[PDB]
Amino acid sequence: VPLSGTNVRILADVPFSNDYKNTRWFTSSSNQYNWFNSKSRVYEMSKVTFMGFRENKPYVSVSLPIDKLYSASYIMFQNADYGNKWFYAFVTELEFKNSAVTYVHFEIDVLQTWMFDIKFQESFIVREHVKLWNDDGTPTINTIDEGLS
């Protein structure tokens, strides 16, 4: 995961977070890009460098006052050296450095970023959504004890 970016865009209104309880799943990267591309661009940069240096504090310097970046929720960017791949990241915290300069902290969204590179193998499934009705209108058989009154 890169530490210098191109085509960088800071987005507003991305409805999921680094709690990772929810995400928007996609059938293709093209669809994924289109979805993010319909989000409001709070700020854009053609070429930028990332710092931190220390683990867990990666960020990008933006030349706006911290009040102007409150809507920021997400970042997407490309790296010139690994083709047309998009990297996606949560905006986690705005750090006031100077006035008229904010440090925008981000954390790589591992789901969105690696969505089509992951291969799921056989796993213990605690819960999932299953087929409810057979073709003939009869219920499927699911009798695992739910332990609910």
Binding site: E122, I141, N142, T143, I144
Partner: protein, 94 residues
């Protein structure tokens, strides 16, 4: 109504629970609760191994040796083919 003599009725668990338990056993073997040497390479594709308070010796700094004991006490899967993670295979003996 034709009831005479003795009847042998053979019973087994339903498809739902067979699938459930079989898939669990396939990936994680059986509960053993024995003090013995572990089965490391007895299956063709993979061996799951989980110990408690295991004993492992060797010419190794004790730090690495302690790490290794911890690894088996936490449970680990030992693969015997290049197709790591593919659980569809039969994984028969030898």
């Amino acid at each position: 109504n034709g009831y005479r003599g003795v009847y042998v009725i053979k019973k087994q668990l339903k498809a739902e629970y067979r699938r459930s338990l079989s898939s669990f056993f396939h990936k994680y073997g059986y509960k053993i609760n024995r003090v013995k040497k572990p089965n490391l390479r007895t299956r063709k594709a993979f061996n799951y191994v989980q110990t408690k308070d295991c004993f492992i010796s060797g010419d190794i700094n004790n730090n690495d040796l302690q790490e290794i004991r911890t690894i088996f006490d936490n449970g680990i899967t030992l693969w015997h083919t290049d197709n790591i993670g593919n659980y569809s295979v039969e994984n028969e003996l030898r």
